[PDB]
Amino acid sequence: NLTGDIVIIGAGAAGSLLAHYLARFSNMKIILLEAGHSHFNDPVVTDPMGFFGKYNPPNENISMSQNPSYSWQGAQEPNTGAYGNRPIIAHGMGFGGSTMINRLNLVVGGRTVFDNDWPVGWKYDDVKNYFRRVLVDINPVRDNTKASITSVALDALRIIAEQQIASGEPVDFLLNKATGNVPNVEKTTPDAVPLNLNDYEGVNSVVAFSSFYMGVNQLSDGNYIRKYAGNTYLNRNYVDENGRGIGKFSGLRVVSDAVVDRIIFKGNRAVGVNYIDREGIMHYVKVNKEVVVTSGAFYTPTILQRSGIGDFTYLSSIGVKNLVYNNPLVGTGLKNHYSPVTITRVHGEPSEVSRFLSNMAANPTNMGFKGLAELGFHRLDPNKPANANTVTYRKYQLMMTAGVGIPAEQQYLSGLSPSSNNLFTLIADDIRFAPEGYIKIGTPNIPRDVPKIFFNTFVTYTPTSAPADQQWPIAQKTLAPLISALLGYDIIYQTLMSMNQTARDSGFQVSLEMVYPLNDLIYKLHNGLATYGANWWHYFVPTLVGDDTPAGREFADTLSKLSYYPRVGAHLDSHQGCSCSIGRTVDSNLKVIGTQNVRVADLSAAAFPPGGNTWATASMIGARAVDLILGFPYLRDLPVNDVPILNVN
Amino acid sequence: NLTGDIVIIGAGAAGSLLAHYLARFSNMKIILLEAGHSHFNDPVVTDPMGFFGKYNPPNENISMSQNPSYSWQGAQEPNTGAYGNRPIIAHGMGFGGSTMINRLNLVVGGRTVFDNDWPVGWKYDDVKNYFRRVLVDINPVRDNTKASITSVALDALRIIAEQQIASGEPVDFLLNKATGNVPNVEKTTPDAVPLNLNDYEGVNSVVAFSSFYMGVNQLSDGNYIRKYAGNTYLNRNYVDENGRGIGKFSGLRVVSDAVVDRIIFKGNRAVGVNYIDREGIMHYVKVNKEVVVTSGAFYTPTILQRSGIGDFTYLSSIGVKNLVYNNPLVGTGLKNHYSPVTITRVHGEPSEVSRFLSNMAANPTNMGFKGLAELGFHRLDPNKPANANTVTYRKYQLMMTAGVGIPAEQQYLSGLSPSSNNLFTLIADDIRFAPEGYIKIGTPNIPRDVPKIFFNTFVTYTPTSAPADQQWPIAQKTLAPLISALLGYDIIYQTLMSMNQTARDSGFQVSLEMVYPLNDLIYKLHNGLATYGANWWHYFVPTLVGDDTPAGREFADTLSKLSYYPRVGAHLDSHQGCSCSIGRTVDSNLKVIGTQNVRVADLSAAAFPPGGNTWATASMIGARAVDLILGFPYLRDLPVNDVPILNVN
Ligand SMILES: Cc1cc2nc3c(=O)[nH]c(=O)nc-3n(C[C@H](O)[C@H](O)[C@H](O)COP(=O)(O)OP(=O)(O)OC[C@H]3O[C@@H](n4cnc5c(N)ncnc54)[C@H](O)[C@@H]3O)c2cc1C
Ligand SMILES: Cc1cc2nc3c(=O)[nH]c(=O)nc-3n(C[C@H](O)[C@H](O)[C@H](O)COP(=O)(O)OP(=O)(O)OC[C@H]3O[C@@H](n4cnc5c(N)ncnc54)[C@H](O)[C@@H]3O)c2cc1C
Known part of the structure; x- marks a missing residue:
């Protein structure tokens, strides 16, 4: 034996x-x-x-x-x-x-x-x-190959990071405590030093970079x-x-x-x-x-x-x-972990769109990944750790790839073909x-x-007959994954909006449109965050809210439709x-x-x-x-x- | 040992x-x-x-x-x-x-x-x-429990059966060689004798009945x-x-x-x-x-x-x-075997609809099944065995149940809720x-x-560069399951149109509407079958047809959109x-x-x-x-x- x-x-x-x-x-x-x-x-x-x-x-x-x-x-x-x-x-x-x-x-x-x-x-x-x-x-x-789109995205994140540092709010997704007041975003200047998300002493908890x-x-x-x-x-x-x-x-x-x-x-x-x-x-x-x-x-x-x-x-x-x-x-x-998927369509002349999307093809040194970051909590996520304002927690791994990363059934339903040379992928992977x-x-x-x-992941909260105030802390935990996932969509949305600007600044005649999930829905979501603020997520349970206005119903309706995409427009890791x-x-x-x-x-x-x-x-x-x-x-x-x-x- | x-x-x-x-x-x-x-x-x-x-x-x-x-x-x-x-x-x-x-x-x-x-x-x-x-x-x-709707449906199949018999065409789905000219449909009088699909000598190859x-x-x-x-x-x-x-x-x-x-x-x-x-x-x-x-x-x-x-x-x-x-x-x-699912809505006063859909609940004696049949080939299925005109083949097992039998994702996408009391299910199960x-x-x-x-089930046919005449028989085999599956839908459409008549005749103030797949597609499908006949299925491959008429494109598009439903609007048995x-x-x-x-x-x-x-x-x-x-x-x-x-x- x-x-x-x-x-x-x-x-x-x-x-x-x-x-x-x-x-x-x-x-x-x-x-x-x-x-x-x-x-x-x-x-x-x-x-x-x-x-x-x-x-x-x-x-x-x-x-x-x-x-x-x-x-x-x-x-x-x-x-x-x-x-x-x-x-x-x-x-x-x-x-x-x-x-x-x-x-x-x-x-x-x-x-x-x-x-x-x-x-x-x-x-x-x-x-x-x-x-x-x-x-x-x-x-x-x-990654052995620099792509223009990577620099455009970095410069876009730099601006947002600057807005966040300056606004002074204690926790938000591009803030990184150990690197202080200066955005922890890799430079796109000629002689930039690469940032290592794995730095030995762990300074770069939250960080945006050109290469994994x-x-x-x-x-x-x-x-x-x-x-x-x-x-x-x-x-x-x-x-x-x-x-x-x-x-x-x-x-x-x-x-x-x-x-x-x-x-x-x-x-x-x-x-x-x-x-x-x-x-x-x-x-x-x-x-x-x-x-x-x-x-x-x-x-x-x-x-x-x-x-x-x-x-x-x-x-x-x-x-x-x-x-x-x-x-x-x-x-x-x-x-x-869990990876909801988003898709972007790039508008402009075909030859110019092509230029913007060059050098994205997968090879061994990158496995398809062209960036971008390890991110923190979105400011409007109610489920932050207690000490989240004094040490910087990772919440998302933001990945950018060429191609069309949604499932085959969803490609059909969405009209987004993988053979369309004007599309690319962003993923805010929930790593908490x-x-x-x-x-x-x-x-x-x-x-x-x-x-x-x-x-079981994105479960619903089913309302009881108890007073609203006693249910809300319960609802908060149950809804935790939907909440974080939708905030992931907004992170990508924010980022795409600054890229519409930095792309122009870098000499590209293009505009970018988030097309999966539906453009109309994400727009509506962003506005709702601004409108309802911290308790925006209450609208996952409309019946506890008691807001029977045309405006109110539309936002509840928007979150309802949106809850579908992390469910099936996504991949379990x-x-x-x-x-x-x-x-x-x-x-x-x-x-x-x-x-x-x-x-x-x-x-x-x-x-x-x-x-x-x-x-x-x-x-x-x-x-x-x-x-x-x-x-x-x-x-x-x-x-x-x-x-x-x-x-x- | x-x-x-x-x-x-x-x-x-x-x-x-x-x-x-x-x-x-x-x-x-x-x-x-x-x-x-x-x-x-x-x-x-x-x-x-x-x-x-x-x-x-x-x-x-x-x-x-x-x-x-x-x-x-x-x-x-x-x-x-x-x-x-x-x-x-x-x-x-x-x-x-x-x-x-x-x-x-x-x-x-x-x-x-x-x-x-x-x-x-x-x-x-x-x-x-x-x-x-x-x-x-x-x-x-x-089944220990009679439901009016089962009989309403049977009398509806009888009517279709008389028409098929009368037309004299050799193969169609309610024809049964061993029972000659008489509809092999269970009668609906007070003292009707039950039909046994498992009859010892095998006479009832194609047959409609109240009970499995x-x-x-x-x-x-x-x-x-x-x-x-x-x-x-x-x-x-x-x-x-x-x-x-x-x-x-x-x-x-x-x-x-x-x-x-x-x-x-x-x-x-x-x-x-x-x-x-x-x-x-x-x-x-x-x-x-x-x-x-x-x-x-x-x-x-x-x-x-x-x-x-x-x-x-x-x-x-x-x-x-x-x-x-x-x-x-x-x-x-x-x-x-394989079961594409269809869903029907019953219209009318809430009280009359309730009466019409009554007594359908599942119990041990019926396991939810309220009928109905073993059917033969649809006349427009090109894939019949060589001797289908001299012996009667079973092609579909037809089931009727209460509730909404489509997958959860399809209920959401379609808007058909299982807790909604005006819906029921029909299945033409392909047993060839x-x-x-x-x-x-x-x-x-x-x-x-x-x-x-x-x-692998409902695969597509990818056209080659060879002449059409040589490709069609290849495409015919490849598409056999889509062909048989959409025709199952048409059998069901037909049954329902005739049920609109027999329901009224039995004193029910209701109308019936097929709502899954989309009513518009099925209507368009039925008309194309009448219009294009035996070669209707050529339109699964538009590029080989060379029919650049507005009409040709709509029917092709229609077959495309309908091909989605047997894939995911279904259950593998x-x-x-x-x-x-x-x-x-x-x-x-x-x-x-x-x-x-x-x-x-x-x-x-x-x-x-x-x-x-x-x-x-x-x-x-x-x-x-x-x-x-x-x-x-x-x-x-x-x-x-x-x-x-x-x-x-
Ligand atoms: C599709 C996929 C994508 C991933 N992506 C990456 C990535 O890009 N980056 C990353 O950091 N990680 C990735 N991982 C995850 C990472 O590889 C795992 O978390 C890690 O390998 C876990 O290591 P482990 O030893 O604990 O388990 P494992 O690596 O999976 O080792 C399990 C081993 O146990 C053996 N075993 C199981 N049962 C028995 C038995 N009864 N008798 C004998 N042997 C047995 C198995 O054969 C296997 O070799 C991915 C994994 C998969 C499957
Ligand atoms: C969910 C479901 C719904 C269905 N409903 C119906 C219906 O409504 N009507 C109908 O007519 N039929 C129904 N069937 C189909 C029917 O049950 C099967 O086709 C039929 O039972 C097949 O019988 P079988 O002997 O071939 O295999 P099985 O009935 O499945 O028995 C095979 C046995 O071999 C055992 N076995 C397998 N591997 C090993 C091993 N390595 N060592 C020792 N033992 C092993 C298995 O555990 C099993 O006990 C359904 C089946 C399922 C699962």
């Missing part, structure tokens, strides 16, 4: 890293069990453009996130906040987990979230060096390669074709195509792990010291529940026999997304693509996390409460979602786990010039 | 019956392995109204077909024919499989389909006693119980709490919560079966004589594939180690649904809710089948081609979808397997008065 000291389940963003460094810095037998296999020579994966379908077969034309050979297919339960829709969200299945199939925008998340929303021991000064490690191991690149950082490396022949958790830590320099570690890493054994079932216990001590090989034969791995679960937000909790740790009452009811620890929180508190959900295994036997995953978070399923040392020796070290342990894409944060937890398990800051103390050596195979 | 002579995988419609009668008529050891467990004490299942959500928790308000604890969640691949939508279609999981969670409309499927689309040895006179056995075991009931037959039985206290494959064949009179067959049935052993992995071979002879119990332990069952796979259309082929039966190149390439027989057809030829698909395991290790399932069919994966004895001793005896074996709901047909095949395995018509010769005795626990 296989026998290991530390057994790790899941070779994802966290597990690959965890596995790599544990082998290096210890003398233990490390066994890494992974459901998939390596895709080191699969152009669908290794060429960053493969994500966009460059190498898809024509008769089975599906993305990796839709393809069961490449991923887990997490079909969630009906979204009561979105017309009963059932989005299917993926976890990658292979070396690198989800980093194998993702869009590679690598974001730390800002200082603020870790200082306020994470516990003692997990504050930003505790994790910044681990983040630094994750980044240097990847060594991400900036993509997880790719350029090879000596000039191609770009996906640089991800998979080929970075588990390539042939470190692990041979039989899954055996090399040299300093000889303690590692990587088991490919190993679908783990459960953790085996003696009392509250983990002693073994079950998995099934590709022949349908079951194997037992004996555990000498610890089990570490790194199977993703959806699946880590389903493994604990199936292993007998979770809500006893529920588990017994579905036929789970061996119960280990009663903790009803396992799998609860599921969080994500209010909905919270939970995960429950439906059956006890085996891992399934589809546990119960409950995650694949940034799921926090389903087994610190303080709920595990302690501050990542050990599962109620067990002697099981830890969770992936994104599902995150106390609160990071301000931006989640890969960086996920690898960071894994990084710390190396040091937690080993009892010394080996990886924290490691010089930044020592990084894993890349092998493409 | 367990050892059996015959091992059955899946206690579904087919599997439950097969196990039951095999134990009775033989001395063999029968082992039935089922992934779920019995739900004989679960009111959600046993109460027919539980289907509609009667015992649903308000916070997890999901149907059985949506609940992973009650079913497999078959999320299919993006449908290129429906805006990239990814429907999640269920198989029931428990004693009775899908008959445990289904809507209980019990339909044989008609003589015509078995006589023509099924092979020799499987014609209707070959199977009719097996169908009878299935029905008497269940003993379905008629529901799989419910009435108990002595007046409640109704779901009467389904699970409790009919596997209740406590026949199988004990430990899974041991009782008395004459003592050779049967039933394993609950048994997730089967694969079949083990010695050469091409099946010798074993793998499963995982609810404790996560793998077990081996030895097979002395035969394995019968009855796991449903989605999963029966994935079991075979994991077993080494399928496309060697694909299977090898994904790590299936042990290969048995090369047949690339395994999992191909997948068919289903043209699309064909396929199933492929994504991984070799374990059963997954989500293999690759390709099923949960009637998937034919994925391992006779003549392709298995022979006429249900034996898997290339094996000594494996059979498929569930709906995946079906040669062609029955004309209506598939439960009856699924069970019929299992029934034949009984006589096929045993070598004599025991079950065929069994008197109709000898039936399983119900024990409710």
Whole structure:
């Protein structure tokens, strides 16, 4: 039988890293069990453009996130906040987990979230060096191509930022406390210094910039390669074709195509792990010291529940026999990000519109992204944190792309064709997304693509007969996601209006029109914000308002029609996390409460979602786990010039 | 270890019956392995109204077909024919499989389909006693409640029927060859005799009626119980709490919560079966004589594939180690039915409308269905079988229900609220649904809710540069489903125009208006059909017609706008089948081609979808397997008065 000291389940963003460094810095037998296999020579994966379908077969034309050979297919339960829709969200299945199939925008998340929303021991000064490690191991690149539209948008945001600083209101979406009075917007002067949304000390919580950082490396022949958790830590320099570690890493054994079932216990001590090989034969791995679960937000909790740790009452009811620890929180508190989409039509002469939209085509160094910012709360969002006026919170990741980013059904309904060369995309991604959900295994036997995953977003508030004043604070929470999402539309609207000016100033004969959601509706929304001010959001519940004027009805009507677009004119992110978070399923040392020796070290342990894409944060937890398990800051103390050596195979 | 002579995988419609009668008529050891467990004490299942959500928790308000604890969640691949939508279609999981969670409309499927689309040895006179056995075991009931609107509608179909008969055209949708010149429409007098769509000799291929037959039985206290494959064949009179067959049935052993992995071979002879119990332990069952796979259309082929039966190149390439027989057809030829939805509004005084739409509420004896018919081909459908003028084919199953049966998003977009008391639903279900698909395991290790399932429905035809005369027959096949689907709408338009007359005649002061899809489009559609005749469907591809008249463009535009509705104004039925069919994966004895001793005896074996709901047909095949395995018509010769005795626990 296989026998290991530390057994790790899941070779994802966290597990690959965890596995790599544990082998290096210890003398233990490390066994890494992974459901998939390596895709080191699969152009669908290794060429960053493969994500966009460059190498898809024509008769089975599906993305990796839709393809069961490449991923887990997490079909969630009906979204009561979105017309009963059932989005299917993926976890990658292979070396690198989800980093194998993702869009590679690598974001730390800002200082603020870790200082306020994470516990003692997990504050930003505790994790910044681990983040630094994750980044240097990847060594991400900036966009290799300047586009005129990016500068136009920056100069437009500069003006708005100036209006905001000057007006003196305490919180608004382009204010950034640590950079004081001067707009924290990258300059568009000849010799501008690039701004790094990932600056080491976290000064740039809110910031607008010309380029994100993509997880790719350029090879000596000039191609770009996906640089991800998979080929970075588990390539042939470190692990041979039989899954055996090399040299300093000889303690590692990587088991490919190993679908783990459960953790085996003696009392509250983990002693073994079950998995099934590709022949349908079951194997037992004996555990000498610890089990570490790194199977993703959806699946880590389903493994604990199936292993007998979770809500006893529920588990017994579905036929789970061996119960280990009663903790009803396992799998609860599921969080994500969410990306409503907007579309702009550019008016003017075709040749001139063309000039304005040049250099936007996606390539590996940008993955389609041409900017722009990490933003704060809109001034009229009622749901700001208590101390939001004294530290600057991230609320939106603003992304600009070429093309037409709305869903196919919506393209038809809207008349907006992806083949129209006068259209482009803006996204205000809500990265403090209010909905919270939970995960429950439906059956006890085996891992399934589809546990119960409950995650409801843009729900309605249904009025009671109670006095208005008692309902409004209730309504405020329920409506939180619609509220933030509509304010996202206004941010983009404001921004487009200044761009109408700065575009002209930069010599472009164009005008810009927001056309999805409907131009007429957004205009009406902006005016309503000015009109009704802070309590504008009351009009989501007209019947509690008692404003039966022609003017009043029209604004209530406007918000009603608008609530449709974040529901279906949008994409749910694949940034799921926090389903087994610190303080709920595990302690501050990542050990599962109620067990002697099981830890969770992936994104599902995150106390609160990071301000931006989640890969960086996920690898960071894994990084710390190396040091937690080993009892010394080996990886924290490691010089930044020592990084894993890349092998493409 | 367990050892059996015959091992059955899946206690579904087919599997439950097969196990039951095999134990009775033989001395063999029968082992039935089922992934779920019995739900004989679960009111959600046993109460027919539980289907509609009667015992649903308000916070997890999901149907059985949506609940992973009650079913497999078959999320299919993006449908290129429906805006990239990814429907999640269920198989029931428990004693009775899908008959445990289904809507209980019990339909044989008609003589015509078995006589023509099924092979020799499987014609209707070959199977009719097996169908009878299935029905008497269940003993379905008629609607216990008469609604005026059902009869108003019937009399309306009679009128259309007289016109069709009189015109003398060979094929149109209310024509029935076996009933000559007389309308095959149920009469509406005080003492009218009921028409039986499941009539023994199959006369009523096309027929209009007041009542379907529901799989419910009435108990002595007046409640109704779901009467389904699970409790009919596997209740406590026949199988004990430990899974041991009782008395004459003592050779049967039933394993609950048994997730089967694969079949083990010695050469091409099946010798074993793998499963995982609810404790996560793998077990081996030895097979002395035969394995019968009855796991449903989605999963029966994935079991075979994991077993080494399928496309060697694909299977090898994904790590299936042990290969048995090369047949690339395994999992191909997948068919289903499909239900576009229409909505009608009733005009008039509130009080008169209320009276007209009265008595439609769903109960166990009707499961919401208030009629109406099995219809033949529309005269303008270019895709009739060659002999449609000499034998009468079923093409649509026509259903009438109260309420608003379109998806939530379409209710919002359309403005039709389900809580509005002047609306009702009509469905012309295409039961000769043209699309064909396929199933492929994504991984070799374990059963997954989500293999690759390709099923594209209402696809477009893209013109080539070749002459029109050469393209039209290609476009004709591609467009078959849109063609058949819009014509379903026209059947329904027609029925409603004639109902406006018969409603008035029955003393109701009302008028009826089709409101989903938009009244204007359907009006325009009807006129075009009259105007353009047989070649009306050429206007799905305007660029080939070269009719640049104002009129031509309006009808083309009209077909474009209408093509939206069957895509999203609809439901894919949960009637998937034919994925391992006779003549392709298995022979006429249900034996898997290339094996000594494996059979498929569930709906995946079906040669062609029955004309209506598939439960009856699924069970019929299992029934034949009984006589096929045993070598004599025991079950065929069994008197109709000898039936399983119900024990409710
Ligand atoms: C479509 C998509 C787009 C994304 N976009 C980006 C982006 O642009 N930027 C960004 O920062 N992040 C992106 N991500 C998100 C980011 O990759 C994840 O949040 C991060 O990878 C989480 O890492 P993890 O280790 O915690 O989980 P994962 O990375 O997903 O690792 C899970 C691993 O566990 C394995 N596993 C699961 N169950 C078992 C089992 N029973 N037995 C054995 N192994 C098992 C899986 O095979 C998988 O390898 C995207 C992800 C997807 C799917
Ligand atoms: C929501 C819904 C509505 C429908 N309503 C109707 C209706 O109104 N009228 C009608 O005539 N029909 C209805 N049906 C269709 C009908 O139920 C099915 O076509 C018919 O039951 C198919 O029977 P089957 O034997 O082929 O498969 P199933 O009845 O579905 O049974 C297959 C069994 O095999 C089990 N199984 C699968 N994989 C494994 C494994 N690896 N190991 C062990 N066991 C396994 C499954 O869990 C299941 O128990 C409906 C079905 C659904 C889901």
